[PDB]
A paper describes a structure:
During activation of a pentameric ligand-gated ion channel (pLGIC), the binding of agonists promotes the opening of a selective ion conduction pore at a distance of more than 50 Å away from the binding sites. Each subunit consists of a predominantly β-stranded extracellular domain and an α-helical transmembrane pore, which interact via an extended interface. Whereas ELIC forms a cation-selective channel with high conductance that is activated with high efficacy by the primary amines cysteamine, propylamine, and GABA, the cation-selective GLIC is activated by protons and inhibited by bulky positively charged compounds that also act as open channel blockers of the nAChR. Our study has identified a cluster of interacting residues located at the β1-β2 turn, the β6-β7 loop and the pre-M1 region of the extracellular domain, and the M2-M3 loop of the pore that exert a strong influence on channel function.
For two cases, the ELIC mutants F116A of the β6-β7 loop and Y258A of the M2-M3 loop, we have grown crystals and determined structures at 3.5 and 3.2 Å, respectively. Both mutants crystallized in the same nonconducting conformation that has been observed in all known ELIC structures. Small structural differences in the vicinity of the respective mutations indicate local rearrangements of protein interactions due to the loss of the bulky aromatic side chains. The data suggests that the mutations, despite their severe phenotype on channel activation, have only a local effect on the protein structure. Neither of the two mutants display ligand-induced channel activity in any of numerous independent recordings. In the background of the mutant R91A, both nonactivatable mutants F116A and Y258A bind agonist and antagonist with similar Keff as the single mutant R91A, thus emphasizing that the mutation has likely not affected ligand binding but instead interfered with channel activation. Similarly, our study has shown that mutations of the corresponding positions in the two prokaryotic channels (T248A, Y250A in GLIC and L256A, Y258A in ELIC) have interfered with activation but not ligand binding, as suggested by the calorimetry experiments of the ELIC mutant Y258A. In both nonconducting conformations, the interactions with the C-terminal part of the M2-M3 loop with the β6-β7 linker remain intact, and the observed nonactivating phenotype of respective mutations (F116A and Y258A in ELIC and F115A and Y250A in GLIC) could thus originate from an interruption of the coupling between the extracellular domain and the pore region.
Author numbering:
A (entry chain E), B (entry chain D), C (entry chain C), D (entry chain B), E (entry chain A): 11 to 317
Amino acid sequence: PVDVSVSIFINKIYGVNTLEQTYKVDGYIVAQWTGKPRKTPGDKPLIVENTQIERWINNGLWVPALEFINVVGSPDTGNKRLMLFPDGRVIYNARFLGSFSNDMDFRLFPFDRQQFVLELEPFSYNNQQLRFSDIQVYTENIDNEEIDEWWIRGKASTHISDIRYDHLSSVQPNQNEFSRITVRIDAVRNPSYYLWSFILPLGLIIAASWSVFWLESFSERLQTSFTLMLTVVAYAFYTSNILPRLPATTVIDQMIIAGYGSIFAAILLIIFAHHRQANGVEDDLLIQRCRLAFPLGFLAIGCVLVI
Amino acid sequence: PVDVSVSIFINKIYGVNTLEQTYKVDGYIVAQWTGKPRKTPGDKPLIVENTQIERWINNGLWVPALEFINVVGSPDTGNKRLMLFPDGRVIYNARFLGSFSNDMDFRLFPFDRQQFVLELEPFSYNNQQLRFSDIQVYTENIDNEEIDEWWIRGKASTHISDIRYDHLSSVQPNQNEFSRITVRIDAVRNPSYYLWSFILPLGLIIAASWSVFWLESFSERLQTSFTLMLTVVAYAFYTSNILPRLPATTVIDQMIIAGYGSIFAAILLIIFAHHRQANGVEDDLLIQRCRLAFPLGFLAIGCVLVI
Amino acid sequence: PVDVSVSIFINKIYGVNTLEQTYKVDGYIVAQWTGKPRKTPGDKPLIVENTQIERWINNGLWVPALEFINVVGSPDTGNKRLMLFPDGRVIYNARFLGSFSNDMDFRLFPFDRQQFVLELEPFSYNNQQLRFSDIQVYTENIDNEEIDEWWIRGKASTHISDIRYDHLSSVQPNQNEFSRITVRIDAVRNPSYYLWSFILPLGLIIAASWSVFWLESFSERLQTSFTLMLTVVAYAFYTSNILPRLPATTVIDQMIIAGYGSIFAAILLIIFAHHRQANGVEDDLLIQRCRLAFPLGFLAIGCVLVI
Amino acid sequence: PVDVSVSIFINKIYGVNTLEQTYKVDGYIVAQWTGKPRKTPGDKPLIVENTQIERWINNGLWVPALEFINVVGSPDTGNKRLMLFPDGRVIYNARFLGSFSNDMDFRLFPFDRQQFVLELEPFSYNNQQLRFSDIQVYTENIDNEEIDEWWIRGKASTHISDIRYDHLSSVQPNQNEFSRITVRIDAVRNPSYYLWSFILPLGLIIAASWSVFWLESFSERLQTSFTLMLTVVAYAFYTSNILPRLPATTVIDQMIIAGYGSIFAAILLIIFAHHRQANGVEDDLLIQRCRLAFPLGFLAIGCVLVI
Amino acid sequence: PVDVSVSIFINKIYGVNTLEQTYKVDGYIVAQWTGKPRKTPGDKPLIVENTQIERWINNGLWVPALEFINVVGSPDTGNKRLMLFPDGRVIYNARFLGSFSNDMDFRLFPFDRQQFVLELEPFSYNNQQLRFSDIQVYTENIDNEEIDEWWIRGKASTHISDIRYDHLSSVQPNQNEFSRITVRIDAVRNPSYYLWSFILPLGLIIAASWSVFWLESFSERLQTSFTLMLTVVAYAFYTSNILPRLPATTVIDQMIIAGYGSIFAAILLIIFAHHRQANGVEDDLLIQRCRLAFPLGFLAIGCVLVI
C-alpha cells in the first residue's frame, strides 16, 4: 500500500447556496508519495506543468485520481504540476475551485452556525493509503471578523478514516476499504446586519401595532388594524425576497408569523370588547388592560419560543 | 448478445426546476460485462483512469456508449475508470452530475408528489442486453425527513424493458428492439414551510376580511373593503414571487383567487344591503346574518373544492 | 451531387425566451448517404462512436458538417455515432440540445400562438443535395394538453428548398444555391392559468373600482379613488414581475392601461359632478347615471379594442 | 504585406446588457488572401472543415489569428472551414456568437439611441493588411420595425484604419502599426412599449396627485397626500424593478423624481395655506389658485428639463 | 535565475460582485525573457499562435506557468502567441478575461471607494525572477467620468515583492521565496445616481413624516403614522431590491433605519402627548414644539453619525 501525504490550502470559502446546501472552496491541493527512483535532467527535481503532465502518464507514470466525494460537479482546476524527484518522490500540486455539498440546517437563520467539509478519496485504489493530512486554512481569525459575514471558530479539524463499501464486485475477497480524508471548518454567521435592518424594524412594527388600543373609537381601532395588516404583509415580502431563499421556517419567519398572529388577535379583541357586554357597553376595562397586557403576552410567548 | 450489468448510485436528487420540469441527479454509474480474456500486468486487474481510457479504445477496446434517454443536455461526468480483468470481465465506473426530464404535475403545489425517473439505453447496439439493474439510492429514509424538503417513500423501483423503434433504416430485417433500464423514485413534498408562512397568513387575511361586516356605518364597510382588496393583491404578489414559478394554477393560487372573490362578493353584499330596501332601509338582518354566514359560505365552497 | 437523407426526432420543445425570442429543442438528428463501398469487419455494418469518429475523418472519411442556420450558439451534441455499411451507405446519428431563433410576436400574450422552426443547411457544399426530410415530433397530441402549457396543432410541416446566396466569391460561375430543410411546428399558448390568476382578478379590481360611485359623500368618492389608484399600481407590478418579460405591449398590458384610465376618468367625473353645477349643486343625476354607465363605457371600448 | 479581404455577415444583434454595456452578435466571418499555389485533389478547390483545419496548420499552413478587439470573453465559434484554391487563394469562413463591448449612454433611456460596433484586428502581424471590409447586415429595414425593439437606421458603416501601439518591444525599428477593421451599426430604441405602460400611467398618477387640492377640508388634503406619496413610492419600485438596470439617472427616473417633488411640494402648500394667515384663515385664494397653477408649474418646469 | 519582464494591459474593469467581493478584468498579458539562441526561419523572429504553442513545448520549449494568485476560477484566455527571437529572447502574449478577488468594504456604500488589485506569481519556479512590471491601465481619466460609474484616481501602482512560504517540503534547504508582482488601481464610486433616486426621496419621505404633527386631531396624528409606516417599509424593500446586494449595513441602510426610528418615536410622542397630562389635557406645547424640534433632533443625530 502506497503512502500518500496530502496538503489542502484553503484560500476562501464563499458563495453559500441556501437552496441547494452548497458552498464554494478555492485553494490548492498537494499530494506526495514515493515511487521507483528516476533519472532526471542533471539530478535536480524535474517540474512538469499542465499539458505536459499527461505526456508523462502516457509513458507510464502512475498518478492516482483523487476525487472530492462531496463535490457538486467537476471542479475547476487551475494550474497543475508534477514535481519528479530523482530518489523516487513525486509531488502533485494543483489549484482548484469547487462547489461542495454538506447537510446544512438554516432553521435558526440569523443566529445559525454551519460547518464546511471537504471529503477526499482515491477513485480506484484501496491498496493505497493516505498517510497524513495537513490543511492550511490560513484565512484570518483576528483581522476582519465583525466586518466579515462568517466567523471561523477554530483551526480546521482533520480525520483520516476507512470507508467500507459493501455493494461491490465478487472477485475482491476482502479489499473493500478505502482511505478517506475529511476536513471540517466550523463557522458562525455574523447576525449584525440581519439584526439591525430586519429584526429591529420587525420589532418596531410589531410593537407599534399594539398602539392601536390607544385609539378612542371602535371604528378607529378596527379600521387601522387592516392598515397594520397590510404593513406586515409588505414586510414579510421584503423579508423573504431579500434574505436568502429557503424552504424552511426560520427564526425571522417565526417573528413574521408572530406579527401576523398579533394583529389578528388584536382584531378579535377589538371586536370582542365591542360586543362582549350587554346593551353595547364597550368593556373599557379591556382596551386599557390589554393596552399594556397585549405587549406582555407577546413577550411571554417569545420566551416559550426559546423553550 | 453481450450481457451488461449496470449499477446506479444516487447520492443526491436536488435542484427541481418547476418551469422546465427537470431535476439534478448526482451519483455514480457502473456497468460490467465479460469479453475475451486479456493479459494484464502480472495477473491482477488493471486500472485505467480518465484520459488513459481513450488510449485503450484507440487500440480496439470495445466500450459501449450508454445514453440517458431523459437527460437534459450532456451531463457532467467526473472521474471515470475501467477495470480490466484477466478472465475478460470489464467494469466501467464513472461519477456524473446530470439534469433529467420527466412529466411533473405541480397543480396541487404545497401537497403535490412527484417521481424522479432515470432511463438508460445503449446508443448504437440492440444486440447487447442490459442483464440486471441495481440502484443504490441510499439517501436517508429515517434520519432527516421532517427537516428535509422532500420525503422519499420507498427504495427505487426499476424496470428493464425493450423499446420498439419503428422509424428506422431499411437494412435491418428484425433488429429494432433496444434494452432500456428505467429507474423510478417516488417522493412527497414536505408542506410544513408553505403551510405556516403562506397558507396560514392567507387564511388569517381571508378570515379577517369578513370582519368588515362588524363595522357600523356603510361608508366604513365599503371604504375598508378597498383596503382589504389591496392586501390580497399584495399577498398574491408575495406568494407568486417567493414560491417556485409555475404557469399552472396551484392550490395556493385557488386560495388566492378565493380571497379575491370573497372580498368582491362582500362589496356586492355591502352595497346590496344599502340599496336593496325601499325608502333607504339598510337591511340590518343581512349584515348581521352574513356576519356569520359569509364565513360559512367560504368553508362550504372550500369543501366542494376537494370534490 | 450526393443524395443525403435526414431525419429529425424532436423529444421536447421548451424554454421559450420572450426577451430574446428563442426556444430549446432536444432530440436526435440522423443523416444518411451512399459512398464508395467499403471492407467492414466480417461484413456487418461497423459502428463508430463519438471520439472514434474523428479518427475515421483523419483517415479520409467524408463527413459533411451540417449547421443549424437559426441556432443561437454552438449546440450541445450528446452521443454521436457513424454506421458504416459495406455497400457504401453511411449513417450519422447524434443527440443534440440547442437553442434556436425565430420571429415571435407576443402582443396578444395570453392567447398568442407561435411556430417553432428548425432550418438545416450544409456548411460548405452546394454540390450535395438533401433528398428528403422526415421529422418525428412524436410528442403527445392527445395525452396531456389542457395540463400542458402549449398546444401543438398538427404534425410538423417540412419543406426542402433552395436558397440563393449572391454575395460570394468570384470563382464560382453558377454554383451559389444551397439545399435548406425547413421544419415548422405550430403551437398555441394555453391561456387557462393567465385567465384565472391574472385576467380574472384584474377584472374584479377594475369592476370594484366603479363601486366608488356608490359612496354618498364627495370626499368619500375622491379619497377612495387614490386607494384604488394604489391598487392598480400594485397589480401592474405583480403582473409585470411574474409574467414573462417583454418590450412589447400585451393584451394584459392593455387591460392594465385601461384600469389606469378608468380610475383617472372616475376622479375627473367625481370632481366634475361636484363643481359642474351652479351654486354648489352636486349633479346627483350624474353620479347615479354613471353608477351604471361607467361600467358600460368600459365594455363598449373593450369591444372596439378587438376592432 | 499580405492582402486580406474580410466579410462579416451579421445575423442578429440582441441581448443588450445595460449594466455592463455589452451586446451579442451572431453571424459569420469570412477572410480571403492569396498564398503560394498548391496541388489540390484533381484541381478543384479543397474544403477543410472544423477539426481537420488544425491538421493543415501543423503541416505548415499559415492561418493568421484575427482578434475581435472589443469582444468580451472568447466568442463561441460554430462551424469553421478552409477553402484551399489551387492558384494559392485561401478562404476562411466561420460562424460565431460573441459578446462585444462599447460605450453606451442610456441617460435618455426610453428615447435613447446606440451604435453597435465590431473591431477586428490581427493578433500578431503588422506586416499584413486588411484590404477591404464588406459587412452584410441584411437584417430587415422595412419588415418589422414598429414591432421590433430596436430600429436600425442605415446599413452598417465600415472603416479600416491603422492603430499605433507605442508601448512595444525595442527590436522593432518602425513596425508598430496594425490594421483594424471597425464596423458600426446605429440603432434607435422603439419607445412605444415604455410610453404606454410606464410613462403614461406615471403622468396619470402625477396629474391625479394634483386633485388633492379639490378636497374641502384641510385634514382631507394632508392625509390623502400620504396615500399619493405611497403610490409614487410604489410606482418608483415597479419602474426600477421591471425596466433594465442602470447606475444612471434616466428620463423616467427624472419623471419619478418630479412626481416625488410634486407631492412633497403639495404637502408644503397644503400646510402653508392652513397656517399662513392670521387668526386661522385658510387662504382659500391659494387652494383654488394652485388648483390650476400647480399643474402648470410642473408643465413649465418640464419644458426647462428639455433645455 | 531567469529574468522575466511582464506587461499587463488593462482594457476594462467591470462586473463588481458585492456578494462575493470580486471584479472582472479584461486585457492582455505580455512576458519576455531571454534563453539560448535559436535557429529561426531565415532569421526574423518566429510567431507561434494558439494550438501551435504546445507543439513547441512538446519539443522541449520552456514556457513557465504564471498564476493569478487572487483569481476566482481559471481565467478565460483568448488568443495567445509565442514570439521566438533568434538571439534567445522569447515573448509570450495572451488576451484574457478573469475574475479576481480582493477584500472590499462596502459599508459606506453610495460614497465608498475600492481598489482593484492583481497579483502575479510563477506556479512552480522560485529560481526565476520577475524583473520589472509595467501596467498600461490606459482607460480614460478625463473623458467620461461623471457619466461613468467609477472614478479612477491615479495611475496604477505596481510592486514586485518576495513572498515567504513556510509550509513546504523538507528537501529545499533555503529556496522558498517567490517573485510576486502586485498591481493596484484605486477607484471611487460615483454617488450621483444613488443620491438623486434613492437618498433624496428617502430624505423627502423622512422629512414629510414629521408633518404628522401639523394634524389637528389626535386620531389624525396616530392613524396617519401607520400609513407613513407602510411607506418606509415599501421604500426599504425598493431600496434593498434594486441596489447591489450586501450582508452589511450601508449608509443608506442607516438612513433607512433612521427613518424607521423617526416614525416610531413620533408614535410614542403622539401617544405620549395625549396621556401625559392630568384630566385629558393634550399638551399642545409639545406637538408644536416637536413640530420643529423633531426635525432638528434628527439632524442633530445625523451629524453624530459622522463622528
